């Protein structure tokens, strides 16, 4: 679709068989989701943002559907203020900025 | 133009008679720029993201030229790790997400 930016660009995602709401975030290199029970192996990792660094669980090769578009890649789980879809997955669904 | 997301969506902006580089960031509600000395009255504000909050100065009705496209709105200035153009100005230049 074409998504304007008057409101937050929130979309429904499906991950680990569960539906969630997430923000399409072109300023995020990586995808970060709030604490959740996700199937798969994981490794501790640190990710930094505007306020500093947080500890996350790094899951690799996770299936995630973003408004019906399938992606398979890295998902970080940790104390983010909001679920954010970063460029690592936005590229997989063919997302571009246009103006 | 059309901006793919393989790389950081960095562009040149002009603000207060200065050229700077900034990220087109659909995840930022408001535009936040590195410490800069801007004429005018301002309001203190706190903005939060991954890792917590930072303190910024809120300037209203600031003009910014983004790849030749003019926008006028709120600009937050403070010790941000990154310059971001947020939705408050991205809407003004007609920016959409497309996939
Ligand atoms: C020099 C580098 O230092 P740094 O690595 C951190 O640098 C950064 C810091 C922030 C960004 C931009 C933010 N992306 C982000 O958090 O992405 C994470 C995950 O993917 C990684 O890629 C980059 C960082 C990692 C996001 O787009 C926008 N944000 C809100 C989101 C979270 C939704 C609420 S907001 O910034 O909080 C923000 C809040 C209110 C307003 N009005 C304006 C902005 C990009 C690089 O060190 C740590 C001190």
Curated annotation (Swiss-Prot), chains A, B:
Q: Where is this region: Dimerization of protease?
A: 1-5, 49-55, 88-99
Q: Which domain of life is it from?
A: Viruses
Q: List the disulfide bonds.
A: none
The active site annotation covers 25 (for protease activity)
Q: What are the Peptidase A2 domain coordinates in residue numbering? A: 20-89
How it assembles, according to the record, is:
Homodimer, whose active site consists of two apposed aspartic acid residues.
What is this protein's name? Protease
Q: Which organism is it from?
A: Human immunodeficiency virus type 1 group M subtype B (isolate BRU/LAI) (HIV-1)
Q: What fragment of the full-length protein is this?
A: 501 to 599 of 1447
